[PDB]
Design a protein around this ligand. Structure first.
Ligand SMILES: Cc1cc2nc3c(=O)[nH]c(=O)nc-3n(C[C@H](O)[C@H](O)[C@H](O)COP(=O)(O)OP(=O)(O)OC[C@H]3O[C@@H](n4cnc5c(N)ncnc54)[C@H](O)[C@@H]3O)c2cc1C
Ligand SMILES: [Cl-]
Lengths: 5, 296
């Protein structure tokens, strides 16, 4: 991951 | 009238199949209701799933469905859930076909829908030369030229990440101006910034700018917004939170939503986004749904 992870 | 199940899974892709499989293996009656439109139906290959790297997404989905339905106590309907209600007799589901189904518990696994930037030519290239996730499609660009299509503050992060996969141009599209510190960071990552508004995408992945310049790329990335596939979560009063790229259904660390007996997995949850993540949190949701069946 919903983003950078 | 309506058929009774212990658990109904709404959505029959990777997350829903993984959840449904745990319940099937617990010898409970589980029904999957699936509308047949997976998020990844645009790319011809899937990557990043150990044991399935390179395989066709349709084949992955097909194998999973067949091995779930090998359990007599698992069933499938090709249909769309339009309305969900909480009654004393658990949950009641009404489908686009008119069918009603009832369950003690629900697993929401209906995925998200990509809302693509309004750029001429982008939609027809989606999943072929325009992508969302570099872990899924970066490798195959072979270290070539990559355009990051800017769409607000978060695109900066994408631009910083993309040099891992090739020479990156941050096409801000006259929408976001990196600050001083951001411009320096982008500079040391070797990211070129192009600020001109974009007219359209032509060729495979060539960007035509407002001044007529054309910049050819081997692939383009967008950090586009996404919506929930279904209002069902909202109808059941599940807490929905606004993430960086759109809404997700809130869950505890066992995949239970704010509404008891309703669980959620896959892209609609906070830490979804890839097939591997969906398989894992789907399995978690299924075991958790079963535990609640048994212990209340
Ligand atoms: C172009 C593209 C390429 C991608 N490539 C990769 C890759 O290579 N590797 C990777 O790990 N990830 C990839 N992804 C990400 C991946 O597609 C998702 O992480 C994953 O499919 C999510 O699974 P899900 O089971 O959470 O959602 P989905 O796969 O989107 O499936 C949800 C299902 O629920 C159904 N549904 C929706 N609403 C209803 C309703 N009201 N009633 C009944 N059914 C409903 C849908 O029709 C759909 O079948 C890619 C995404 C895109 C867009
Ligand atoms: Cl993608």
């Amino acid at each position: 991951x919903x983003x950078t992870v | 009238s309506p058929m009774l199940f212990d658990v109904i899974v709404i959505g029959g892709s990777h997350a829903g199949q993984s959840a449904a499989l745990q319940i099937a293996r617990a010898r409970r009656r589980v029904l999957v209701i699936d509308a047949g439109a997976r998020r990844n139906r645009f790319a011809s290959q899937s990557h990043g799933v150990i044991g399935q790297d390179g395989r066709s997404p349709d084949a992955i989905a097909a194998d999973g469905k067949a091995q779930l339905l090998a359990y007599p106590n698992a069933q499938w309907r090709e249909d769309s859930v339009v309305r969900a209600e909480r009654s004393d007799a658990g949950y009641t589901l009404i489908c686009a076909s008119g069918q009603h189904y009832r369950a003690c518990q629900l697993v929401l696994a209906f995925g998200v829908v990509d809302e693509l930037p309004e750029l001429e030519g982008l939609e027809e290239r989606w999943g072929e030369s325009v992508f969302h996730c570099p872990y899924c499609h970066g490798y195959e660009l072979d270290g070539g030229r990559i355009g990051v299509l800017g769409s607000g503050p978060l695109s900066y992060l994408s631009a910083m990440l993309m040099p891992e996969w090739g020479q990156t141009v941050f096409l801000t599209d006259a929408s976001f101006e990196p600050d001083e510190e951001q411009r320096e960071a982008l500079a040391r990552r070797g990211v070129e910034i192009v600020r001109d508004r974009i007219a359209r995408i032509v060729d495979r992945a060539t960007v035509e700018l407002a001044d007529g310049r054309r910049i050819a790329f081997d692939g383009l990335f967008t950090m586009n917004r996404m919506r929930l596939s279904s209002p069902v979560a909202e109808q059941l009063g599940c807490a929905i939170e606004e993430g960086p790229l759109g809404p997700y259904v809130r869950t505890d660390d066992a995949m239970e939503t704010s509404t008891p007996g309703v669980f959620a997995c896959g892209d609609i949850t906070h830490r979804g986004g890839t097939v591997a993540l969906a398989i894992g949190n789907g399995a978690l949701a299924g075991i958790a749904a079963h535990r609640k069946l048994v212990f209340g």
